Structures are given as C-alpha cells and as structure tokens.
Design a protein around this ligand. Structure first.
Ligand SMILES: COc1ccc2c(c1)c(CC(=O)O)c(C)n2C(=O)c1ccc(Cl)cc1
Ligand SMILES: COc1ccc2c(c1)c(CC(=O)O)c(C)n2C(=O)c1ccc(Cl)cc1
Ligand SMILES: */C(=C(\CCC)[N+](=O)[O-])c1ccc(-c2cccc(C(=O)O)c2)o1
Lengths: 274, 251
C-alpha cells in the first residue's frame, strides 16, 4: 500500500535509475551477463599473461586504452595508462549522473566541485565491483577480461594496485545489489555533507536525507528477505574510504619511481590536497 | 517482535549504566554547568591540579601518558559491558578477544565525545577539565594527538544522542563481523543484525524529529575508523621521541 510519502520516494528511485542507465554504458546487469554465460559476442577475450595480452591488443577493440606507444618494455605501464584513461572517462560519466541528482546543480558551484572531487573515486570503486568476480575484471567495455593473478604478478609497485579492490569487490558483491539499488547508493555517496571544505552543508544534508530515505525503501522493497541490508550497505562506505587512502599512497610511490609517467590532469586535480 | 527489541534496548542501557561510571548525562550537566571541576588551561593550573586531584618532567609526555592509563581503564569497562551483550559470551573465545581488541579504540573515541565539547574535555571522573587549547599547545606532535578527537566529537555530538542511544551503538561497534582473524563470522553478524534493529527502533522512538538519524550515525563509523588508523600512525611516529619496564608491559 504505497503512501503519499513513499510514493515520492519511489518516483525518486525511478528517476535515478533512469539517469543511471542513461549515464553508465556498462551496467552491472550487462557485466553479469558477460561474466556468467551466453554465446553472443558477450564472451570476453581473457588476458592472463604476456602472450594473451599481446593477442588481446590484436583481438580486443582497445581502439583507445593505450597512449601512443606499446613497446614500452613493461606491460605494467601500458595497463597503467589504460586504467588511467578509463578512470577519466568514469569521472566524466559520474559527473553527468551527478547533474541528474535533484538539487545537485542548484547548490553553490564550489560545493558541486568539492562533492565531485571527493565522491568520484568512492563511486569508481563501488561500480568497479560490478565488473569483478573473485578471478578477474572486465575491461574495454566488457570485451576483455584481465585475471586477478596476472595483475598481481606485475612489477613491484604495479602488482599491488588491484588486489585491494578485488578484496572489496568480492565482499561488496556478496550484498547482491542490482543497478536500481546502486543508482541510489552512488547518489548518497555524492551528496555527503561531511566532505572537506564545503561551504553550505545544510542544503546538501537535506538532499542526502531524502536520498537515504529513498535508498532505505528501495532496499526493503527490492530485497525483502535481506535483513538490515541498508545498514550493511552504509557500513561499506568505510571500506571505500580506505581503498582511496591506500590508493593515494601507491600513487605517491609511482610518481617517485617512474619519472617518465604522470597522472592525467583531471586525476591530478582530483587528488590535489585531498 | 518489536517487544524483544525494546527489551534488548533496556537491558543494554541498564548494563551500560552499571559498567560506565561517568555517563553522557552526567558529563553534560558538568559541562554546561547545571561542584565545578578543576580547570587546567595552562602549565601552573596543571601542576596545581595534580596536587589537588591526585590523578593516580616534560609535561607533553606526562599528559600523553595519562591518556594511556585512562585508556587501559576504559578497556576494562568496555570488556565488562561486552559480556552483557546477548550472545557475546557464547562466541568462540578467540573471536571474543578479536572483537574487543579491534573495537576498544572505536568505542573509546565514541565515549570520549560524551565528555567533550568544542572547548575541552572532562578528566578523572569529571573532577577536572582540560582545555582544548592547552592540549593543542603541547610541543612535538603532542600538540595535536587530541585535536582529531575534538574534531570528531564536535561532529559526533551534533547528533545529540543520549546514553540509551549510545549503549546500543557501542554494542553494534563491538559486534563487527569484519574484524581480521575472526573464526566464526556468522553468529557475530546475526547478533549485530539484532542490535542494529534495536538501534533503529530506539532512534525512531527516541528522536521522532531527527530524520534518518540511524543512517547518519552509521555513517560516523567512517570517521571513527579513519581517526583510529590516524591515531595508530601517530603512536608510531612518537617512538622517535627518546623520553618503567613493568609499566611498558602494562601499556
Ligand atoms: C579504479 O581503480 C583503480 C585502480 C588502479 C589505478 C586507478 C584506478 C588509476 C586511475 C585513478 O586512480 O584515478 C590508476 C592510475 N591506477 C594505477 O595506478 C594502476 C597501476 C597498475 C595497474 Cl596493473 C593498474 C592500475
Ligand atoms: C574512553 O577512554 C578514554 C581514553 C582517554 C581519555 C578518556 C577516556 C577521558 C575521559 C575520562 O577519563 O573520564 C579523558 C579525559 N582522556 C584523555 O584523553 C586524558 C588525557 C590526559 C590525561 Cl592526564 C588524562 C586523560
Ligand atoms: C584499472 C580499473 C579502472 C576502473 C575504472 N579497472 O579494473 O578497469 C584497470 C585494470 C585493468 C585495466 C585495463 C583496462 C583496459 C586495458 C588494459 C590493458 O592492459 O590493455 C588494462 O584498467
């Protein structure tokens, strides 16, 4: 028996899911379909070693997930550049989703920037989980699949970047959330009134309160038998924070060890004084 | 069902009152001024407060030290409270130890907030009040080993939780199924699930006004863990300070 209040919350949930589908080309629904089973070109090419990687570049439409060179001795840096490029693209998608969140574009512009600066990576890790399973991660719009073991065997620094994400993913995936759930959750993440440097926290907390309300209802309707999923999901927010912290440290190592590499401008600004 | 929830809530509250001498209610009365505590706002006041209060060279160090003594006491109070939580004592013994080992820091800061305001913190059963600025004026990195707690506290206290709310929240923190090294995660999550349901009802019945307070409180978990990790890093760096054997053992 939908009430007048719960009615508006359902409308918000629908709106967000709609914008999510429109803003993110590769949904968890598609990722799962690729990862589990089918025959259509949905089957990804699997990269689990140097030779398969070499053939991957030939098979997979890596149209652009590689800078201007390839014979860069180590594949470690080629993967680095590719992952970097995808993140920038993800920031772009998340930024577009954000503008669809009711009230977000009406907030002070400096705060819009602050909210995006701190929320984008937490969102990136949340959604990256949709593309992972305990054995690897979908890449190049789902065309390829790079194994966890392969990524772990990379040169000293690089071989330590992905594991923490996989550990978070296997755990987060156990909540069995679908795209309709995630659309609201990522909205909640963005409208965080506790981000450093925010000018007007009040209007932001008001928007988040309504999102939380929407998320609460969504999880109870969509996952009836999942006791306290709402609270379990909210607690996952601490895991995302840690991933970021740790990630930043690994980045500082790369910056010093690899003088010939550099973070993309967008990413640099995001991490500056974080 | 909702019957067991309020019963659980009452039980936890009663137990919390028995285990924790200085309650938030108590502390607030003393803080807002409603037998004024001795105030330590500088060196001489501290030195005076010592021969007056009798708490139980290098001030910055003696202070940080005092923090430790109280922390150790707090762990015992927390441990006793833990045993009153339904299901806790029935858990694998090693798991009980793991949950306490990783949960006392989070609980310590959570309760520390009850005794703080943006200007200072109550010490020794509330007999004293040490200034935020005095603490913030200590040499070395000591002049900021408490500041992060004050910052958390100011933010945490905005939620206006009371002892009955905190009792259930603390129990939730203790029953965290994600602590490393746990042997049987299931019972732990099942108890926490129960505690979470009790905390939600408690917040809905105790604060009809505050929308999504449950969600907001759970979100503060992020701030506690971040403050704890940061507290650990500070403790290490401190080592670079070269200024008992049984003492070190106790702490
Ligand atoms: C979304 O999760 C990740 C994981 C790793 C990342 C990034 C993002 C970004 C982009 C960003 O952080 O904005 C960079 C630059 N990463 C690397 O350093 C890296 C190094 C070696 C390998 Cl094999 C793979 C990736
Ligand atoms: C929850 O576990 C703790 C840990 C540390 C604590 C307190 C409580 C309290 C609250 C209380 O003791 O009632 C205070 C004031 N703490 C201090 O930081 C401190 C610092 C220097 C000295 Cl000399 C004495 C105490
Ligand atoms: C890093 C993340 C980025 C998520 C937005 N990810 O798991 O996709 C990452 C790991 C692996 C790659 C990657 C993508 C595309 C191509 C390659 C390659 O080595 O050719 C690697 O990005």
């Amino acid at each position: 028996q939908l009430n007048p209040e719960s009615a508006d919350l359902r409308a918000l949930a629908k709106h967000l899911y709609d914008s999510y589908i429109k803003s993110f080309p590769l949904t968890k629904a598609k990722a799962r379909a690729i990862l589990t089973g089918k025959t259509t070109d949905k089957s990804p090419f699997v990269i689990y070693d140097m030779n398969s990687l070499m053939m991957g570049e030939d098979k997979i439409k890596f149209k652009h997930i590689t800078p201007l060179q390839e014979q860069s001795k180590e594949v470690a840096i080629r993967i680095f550049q590719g992952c970097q490029f995808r993140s920038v693209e993800a920031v772009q998608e998340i930024t577009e989703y954000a503008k669809s969140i009711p009230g977000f574009v009406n907030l002070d512009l400096n705060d819009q920037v602050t909210l995006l600066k701190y929320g984008v990576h937490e969102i990136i890790y949340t959604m990256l989980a949709s593309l992972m399973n305990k054995d690897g991660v979908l890449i190049s719009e789902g065309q390829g699949f790079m194994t966890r073991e392969f990524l772990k065997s990379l040169r000293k620094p690089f071989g330590d970047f992905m594991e923490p994400k996989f550990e978070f993913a296997v755990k987060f995936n156990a909540l069995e959330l679908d795209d309709s759930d995630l659309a609201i959750f990522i909205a909640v993440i963005i409208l965080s009134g506790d981000r450093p440097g925010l000018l007007n926290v009040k209007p932001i907390e008001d928007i988040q309160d309504n999102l939380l309300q929407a998320l609460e209802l969504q999880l109870k309707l969509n996952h009836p038998e999942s006791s306290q999923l709402f609270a379990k999901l909210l607690q996952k927010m601490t895991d995302l924070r840690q991933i970021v912290t740790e990630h930043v440290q690994l980045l500082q190592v790369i910056k010093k060890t690899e003088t010939d590499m550099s973070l993309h401008p967008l990413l640099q600004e995001i991490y500056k004084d974080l």
